[PDB]
Structures are given as C-alpha cells and as structure tokens.
Amino acid sequence: MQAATVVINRRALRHNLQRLRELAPASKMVAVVKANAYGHGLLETARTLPDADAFGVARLEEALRLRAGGITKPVLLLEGFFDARDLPTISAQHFHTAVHNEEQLAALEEASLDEPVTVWMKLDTGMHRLGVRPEQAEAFYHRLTQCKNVRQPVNIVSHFARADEPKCGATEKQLAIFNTFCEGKPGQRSIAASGGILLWPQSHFDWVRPGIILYGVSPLKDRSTGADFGCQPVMSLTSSLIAVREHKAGEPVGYGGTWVSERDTRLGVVAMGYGDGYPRAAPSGTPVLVNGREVPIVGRVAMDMICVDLGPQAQDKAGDPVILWGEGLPVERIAEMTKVSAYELITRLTSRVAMKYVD
Amino acid sequence: MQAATVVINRRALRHNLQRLRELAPASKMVAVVKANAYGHGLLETARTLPDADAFGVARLEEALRLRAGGITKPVLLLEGFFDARDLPTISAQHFHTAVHNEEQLAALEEASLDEPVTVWMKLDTGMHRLGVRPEQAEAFYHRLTQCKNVRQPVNIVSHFARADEPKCGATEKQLAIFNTFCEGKPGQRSIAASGGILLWPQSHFDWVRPGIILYGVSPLKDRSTGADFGCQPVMSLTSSLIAVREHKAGEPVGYGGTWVSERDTRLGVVAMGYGDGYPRAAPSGTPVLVNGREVPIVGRVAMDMICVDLGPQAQDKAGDPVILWGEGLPVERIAEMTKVSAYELITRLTSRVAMKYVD
Ligand SMILES: *Cc1c(COP(=O)(O)O)cnc(C)c1O
Numbered sequence: 001m002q003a004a005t006v007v008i009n010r011r012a013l014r015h016n017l018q019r020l021r022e023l024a025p026a027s028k029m030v031a032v033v034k035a036n037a038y039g040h041g042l043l044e045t046a047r048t049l050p051d052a053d054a055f056g057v058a059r060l061e062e063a064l065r066l067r068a069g070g071i072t073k074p075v076l077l078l079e080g081f082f083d084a085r086d087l088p089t090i091s092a093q094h095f096h097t098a099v100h101n102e103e104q105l106a107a108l109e110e111a112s113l114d115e116p117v118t119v120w121m122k123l124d125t126g127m128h129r130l131g132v133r134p135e136q137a138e139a140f141y142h143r144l145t146q147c148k149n150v151r152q153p154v155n156i157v158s159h160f161a162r163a164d165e166p167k168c169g170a171t172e173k174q175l176a177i178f179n180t181f182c183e184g185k186p187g188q189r190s191i192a193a194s195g196g197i198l199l200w201p202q203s204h205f206d207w208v209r210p211g212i213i214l215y216g217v218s219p220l221k222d223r224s225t226g227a228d229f230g231c232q233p234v235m236s237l238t239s240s241l242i243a244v245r246e247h248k249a250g251e252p253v254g255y256g257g258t259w260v261s262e263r264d265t266r267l268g269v270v271a272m273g274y275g276d277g278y279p280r281a282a283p284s285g286t287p288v289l290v291n292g293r294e295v296p297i298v299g300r301v302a303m304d305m306i307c308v309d310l311g312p313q314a315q316d317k318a319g320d321p322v323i324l325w326g327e328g329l330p331v332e333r334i335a336e337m338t339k340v341s342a343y344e345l346i347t348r349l350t351s352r353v354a355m356k357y358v359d
Numbered sequence: 360m361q362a363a364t365v366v367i368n369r370r371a372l373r374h375n376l377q378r379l380r381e382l383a384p385a386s387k388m389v390a391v392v393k394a395n396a397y398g399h400g401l402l403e404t405a406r407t408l409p410d411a412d413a414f415g416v417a418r419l420e421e422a423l424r425l426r427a428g429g430i431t432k433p434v435l436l437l438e439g440f441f442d443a444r445d446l447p448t449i450s451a452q453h454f455h456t457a458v459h460n461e462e463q464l465a466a467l468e469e470a471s472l473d474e475p476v477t478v479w480m481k482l483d484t485g486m487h488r489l490g491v492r493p494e495q496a497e498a499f500y501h502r503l504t505q506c507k508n509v510r511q512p513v514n515i516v517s518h519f520a521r522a523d524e525p526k527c528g529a530t531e532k533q534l535a536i537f538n539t540f541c542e543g544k545p546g547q548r549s550i551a552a553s554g555g556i557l558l559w560p561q562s563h564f565d566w567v568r569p570g571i572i573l574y575g576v577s578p579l580k581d582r583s584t585g586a587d588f589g590c591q592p593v594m595s596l597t598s599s600l601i602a603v604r605e606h607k608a609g610e611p612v613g614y615g616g617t618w619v620s621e622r623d624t625r626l627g628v629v630a631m632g633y634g635d636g637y638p639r640a641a642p643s644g645t646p647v648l649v650n651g652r653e654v655p656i657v658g659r660v661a662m663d664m665i666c667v668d669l670g671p672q673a674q675d676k677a678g679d680p681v682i683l684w685g686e687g688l689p690v691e692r693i694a695e696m697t698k699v700s701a702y703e704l705i706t707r708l709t710s711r712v713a714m715k716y717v718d
C-alpha cells in the first residue's frame with residue numbers, strides 16, 4: 001500500500017517566496033529551512049527555491065548538509081558557531097554567521113583564516129534567548145569592526161518574542177531598542193521573521209527571515225491560515241486505511257477505553273501514529289479526511305495507528321486514501337483542534353514518513 | 360557531535376532481554392522494534408539482540424529494512440500486509456504475518472507462492488482496533504487451516520487495551536475471550552506486551568511481545584520506572600549549552616514572555632528543541648541536567664533551543680554537557696513533568712538527532 005507520507009508541493013513553495021517578496025518588497029529574503037525545513041526536507045526545499053537570497057539554519061551541521069547537496073547560495077548560521085575550530089570551515093564554505101557571545105568574538109579575533117567571514121551581530125532586544133544585551137552591545141560591536149577576519153560592515157540581527165500579539169507593546173519596544181542601536185551604523189539590519197513580515201511593515205528593513213509562512217502556514221494563533229496572506233500550503237500529511245471493521249454500541253476503542261460508541265458503526269484504521277509524528281494528544285473528534293470526507297478520530301492515537309468513525313454502512317475500504325492535513329484540511333485546523341502548535345505539528349515528524357515532491 | 364544526540368546503551372539492551380526472559384521464563388521473545396525501535400534505531404537495536412526469538416514491526420517496510428541490514432531472525436508483521444501483491448516478498452523473506460481481515464485471508468487463499476507463510480490470526484478480544492471479532496473468528500480461523508499457502512498450525516495473537524489498569528476488569532475479560540477461542544486449537548498463543556508481561560503472568564502463554572520495557576522504560580503511568588522491574592534505561596537524550604547569559608529580574612524569557620524572572624540570574628541555552636523531538640509542551644520548571652546538576656527549563660521550548668535557569672554566579676559555560684533524560688534523569692520523570700507519555704517522548708524524535716551506540 002501507501003502508508004505514511006508527506007507530499008510537498010514545490011509549486012506552492014515557489015508561490016510563497018514570490019508572494020512574500022510582494023509583502024516585503026524592499027527586503028531581501030532569508031529562507032529559513034532549519035529542522036529539516038520545518039519537516040518539508042532541508043535539501044529539497046532549498047533546491048525548490050534557487051531564487052532565495054540566502055538560507056537560514058539553526059546549526060552548522062544543517063548548513064554543511066546543504067553544501068553537500070550542491071546548494072551554493074549564502075547560508076546564515078542563525079545561532080552562530082559552537083566551536084572555535086569551526087571558523088575555518090565556515091570561512092571556506094562562505095557561511096555567514098551570527099555572533100552572540102564572548103567565545104565566538106574572541107574566536108574571530110584570534111583565528112587565522114584564508115578569507116574573512118560575513119557576520120551578523122545578534123542583538124538581544126527583548127527575547128532574552130540569544131544575543132548581546134544592550135549595555136554590552138556597543139563595546140562588543142566595536143570589537144567586530146576591528147576584526148581582520150570579519151568582512152566589513154558588521155550586520156545587525158535580532159528576533160521578536162511576541163510579534164503575533166499586536167496588542168502588547170513587546171514588539172514596538174524591541175523595535176525601539178533595535179533602532180537605537182543601529183543609528184549611525186552601516187551594515188544590514190534584520191529583525192523580522194514570519195510575524196514581523198505580515199504584521200509589522202516597520203520591521204522589514206534590509207532582510208526579512210520567512211520561516212513558517214514560507215510553507216503556507218500562519219504563525220499566528222487565531223484561526224488564521226497561510227491563505228489569509230495569499231500563501232499556499234506546501235505539506236500534506238497522508239496515509240491509507242489498513243482496515244474497516246464493524247463496531248457496536250457501548251463498545252470502547254483503543255488504549256484506556258478512551259472512547260465508547262453510542263451506536264453500531266464501522267471503524268477505519270489509519271496507517272498513522274505518533275511513531276510517524278502525529279500528536280498522541282489528538283482528542284477524539286479531531287478531523288481527518290477519508291476519501292475526501294471528514295471523519296472523527298475515535299480513541300487514543302497509538303504509535304502506528306489511528307481509528308476513525310466512518311458510519312454503519314460507510315463503504316470505505318482498506319486501501320483508501322486518508323489525509324491527516326493537506327488539501328481540504330489546513331494544519332492550523334488540526335492545531336486548533338488538538339491544541340498543538342502548527343510549528344510543532346509540521347516539524348516534529350519522524351524518519352518513517354516517506355517524502356514525495358510534486359510539481 | 361556536541362548537539363542533539365541519542366546515546367544508546369547496547370548493554371542495557373541485552374540486560375533487559377535477559378531480564379525479561381527471567382520474568383516470562385516459559386515464553387519466547389518477540390522483540391518489538393517498530394517506529395525505529397522506539398527511537399533507538401531499528402537496525403542497531405536488532406543487531407544488539409541476536410538472541411531475540413523474533414522481531415516485531417508495524418509495517419512491511421520496517422521488516423524489509425531489517426533484511427536489508429542483514430537481520431535474519433523471523434520478523435513478525437504485527438498489522439499484517441496491506442497489499443495482496445506483497446505475499447510473494449513476505450513468503451520469500453520468511454516474514455511471519457498477522458491476518459485480521461477478509462482481504463488478507465482472500466489473498467492467501469488465491470495467491471500462488473513458492474513457500475507457505477507462517478501466520479498469526481489476529482483476534483479482537485476487546486481493544487476494538489485490529490482483529491477478527493469473536494462471532495466471525497471461528498469461520499475465519501477455519502479458512503486459514505485449509506490454506507495451502509499458510510504454514511500449519513495457525514497461531515493466535517491478540518493485544519491488551521488496558522493492562523496498565525489492574526483494577527478494571529478489562530484484561531481479565533480479554534483473557535476470558537482469548538482463552539475461550541483458543542480451547543482445543545494447536546498453534547502458538549500470544550497476547551502479552553510490556554504490561555501483560557509485568558503485571559499478568561497468566562497472559563504469558565507461548566510468546567510475549569516486549570516493547571517499551573525492552574528499552575528500560577515503564578509502560579504504566581504510576582511513576583514507576585524500568586528499574587522497578589530490573590530493566591535498565593537504554594536511551595539518553597543529550598546535547599550541549601550554546602550560551603550562558605546574564606539576565607535581570609522582572610525580565611521574561613522566550614516566545615510569548617511565558618516566564619519572568621524574580622531575580623538576577625544566568626540563563627543557559629541548550630541546543631535542543633522540538634525540531635529534534637523535545638516536547639514543545641514542556642512547562643517551565645521541567646528538569647534538565649546541566650553538568651550533572653538539575654536546573655529548570657524557563658520559558659517556551661523553541662524549535663531549536665531551550666533556556667534553563669542556572670543561577671546568578673553559576674559557572675556553567677557554552678559547550679558544557681546537557682542531559683534531557685537518561686542517566687541521572689529517567690524519561691518517566693520527564694513524562695510526568697510534561698504530562699507527555701514516555702512512549703511518545705522516546706519515539707517522536709526527528710532525523711536531526713544524531714545516534715551514538717555504546718558498549
Ligand atoms: C527559526 C527562526 C526564524 C523563522 O521564524 P518563523 O516564525 O517560523 O518565520 C527566523 N529567524 C530566527 C533567528 C529563527 O531562529
């Protein structure tokens with residue numbers, strides 16, 4: 001049969017990069033493809049977007065994998081490098097890096113490289129995750145402009161912690177801090193990711209870093225989907241039924257007897273579970289498409305299977321197509337129903353899912 | 360590798376199979392290695408247990424991977440085959456299969472194979488997931504004994520839905536149904552997995568199918584660990600700190616400003632997130648080991664990073680060892696703290712996580 005599979009629409013991917021250029025017309029694009037391109041495939045997603053100005057990754061491993069696959073464009077290390085002994089590779093690879101701590105800076109200062117490296121000084125403007133705090137940033141910044149090993153000018157990067165919450169003044173505060181530090185400095189400026197791109201046009205600056213919305217999924221947490229912004233969904237989590245069985249009123253289904261039927265019906269069993277990446281937290285009632293038709297999940301999601309209520313004379317058959325999320329069913333709707341973030345849903349999938357690419 | 364890594368103890372693995380043979384002394388062992396051996400690695404886990412009587416998998420694809428890697432023991436297709444055109448491979452590969460529906464049985468009836476196949480009729484004794492219902496089982500069973508394509512005798516398999524809940528009579532009822540159907544029939548009997556093995560010695564029969572407990576993790580949600588049964592934990596989810604930063608009181612951390620500090624302190628940033636498989640649901644306060652000392656997670660788990668509270672004058676530094684779970688921190692503690700099942704924690708990890716094998 002066909003069991004568990006992720007179908008990636010290359011056409012929708014292309015459409016979204018172009019659509020985002022329309023939303024941030026004066027900014028270059030850093031296609032964020034970390035974590036296996038949000039579950040869509042690191043290398044294939046990069047090869048689908050040869051138009052991207054650059055690619056962003058979390059770790060050095062991911063960037064090197066890109067070069068190994070023949071990706072040639074600039075890759076930004078969003079978290080910088082974790083070992084000073086990596087600088088020579090970074091330099092030779094032409095990898096651009098963020099610099100947020102003393103270790104990285106002192107490494108830049110003492111290293112001996114055949115070529116200087118393009119750098120983005122990570123500023124802490126409010127997220128308090130990575131980055132140099134304001135009161136340390138000027139001195140830190142000045143040391144970078146004095147590096148032989150750093151291409152000039154030093155670029156400045158930062159990230160929003162609550163851009164999806166327009167009513168709290170978090171973003172405007174980070175923007176205030178970002179703007180104060182960049183005054184009078186050359187070099188490119190970057191602080192906007194999906195949220196900043198869609199909701200804050202003041203934060204576009206020179207480079208924007210689309211991640212989730214690049215895949216046609218909304219970064220917000222209203223019921224909004226990628227189509228609210230003209231972005232098309234790229235991923236479809238699919239599978240097939242491996243059984244259609246009779247069931248009777250009063251009888252429970254799955255582990256823990258979580259769901260009990262109030263009527264004689266027919267249950268379908270899907271070749272999909274959390275061993276594939278489908279949330280074990282999915283409550284009975286969560287929507288799933290069987291032969292194009294919404295049916296509810298009944299009972300606890302197991303490691304390899306999911307049961308759905310088809311109906312007493314439902315004519316579904318072992319073999320028939322199932323869509324966990326996809327065309328007809330945005331991953332957002334599954335996020336709302338299961339209470340799991342769309343970011344995690346599309347990303348926390350296992351190596352057992354097979355990967356298809358269409359268009 | 361200094362970042363997301365799963366360290367697998369080959370020797371705790373061996374200890375657990377033998378310890379399970381001591382707990383179920385009159386039953387053969389079906390080492391369940393579905394879903395990439397519960398996150399531990401399908402092929403490596405099989406190669407570590409050349410003593411296993413058989414291996415259990417969810418899908419055909421997994422069994423073929425085992426043959427591809429050189430694994431030669433009998434492999435049991437727990438859900439059977441999804442396509443009739445698969446019987447020829449299954450026969451030739453010497454795969455044993457479950458048979459739960461009409462399609463599979465009719466396939467066996469009219470296939471033409473060079474060799475007959477060993478079969479385990481799946482009986483639905485209460486789980487209502489896969490299997491032939493009691494009232495249809497006798498006729499279905501009889502057709503399998505009349506099959507020239509099926510190696511006689513027909514074996515009988517079933518699975519418990521609530522064996523981890525000794526107080527409800529669910530297990531005794533399934534056992535009652537299982538026993539009634541098996542009366543007078545030859546062929547091996549099997550109904551027990553981890554729970555049945557540890558809590559129900561009257562369900563051991565001929566073959567037991569250890570899954571989660573084989574990896575030294577408890578099946579129950581009673582706070583018990585694998586060590587409660589003499590089983591040693593096999594997996595250690597590890598990483599490293601990529602930053603140690605100053606923080607001030609009243610300042611929030613991570614997306615959504617989820618956590619706010621009541622004191623000046625130092626925060627550590629871990630190269631671990633849900634893009635690796637770590638639960639995004641992990642609440643602030645969840646334990647992590649930094650330099651073998653427990654510190655709490657503060658703020659939201661992100662796709663690639665985790666922040667932890669180290670203390671004001673704490674001397675941990677970027678590069679230092681971090682343990683998400685393993686040696687001084689059982690995955691069962693993390694499950695309780697995050698309210699995520701240990702089954703899902705160890706299994707729903709991504710391909711971003713490196714794999715190490717020790718001993
Ligand atoms: C992952 C990440 C992004 C992308 O964010 P989205 O909300 O998914 O668009 C951009 N920049 C940095 C620093 C990141 O770590």
Ligand SMILES: *Cc1c(COP(=O)(O)O)cnc(C)c1O
Pocket residue numbers: 391393437517518551552553554568569570571572578
């Ligand atoms: C996966 C499974 C098992 C093993 O279960 P554990 O709870 O990890 O012990 C055994 N038998 C069947 C039918 C299964 O699907």
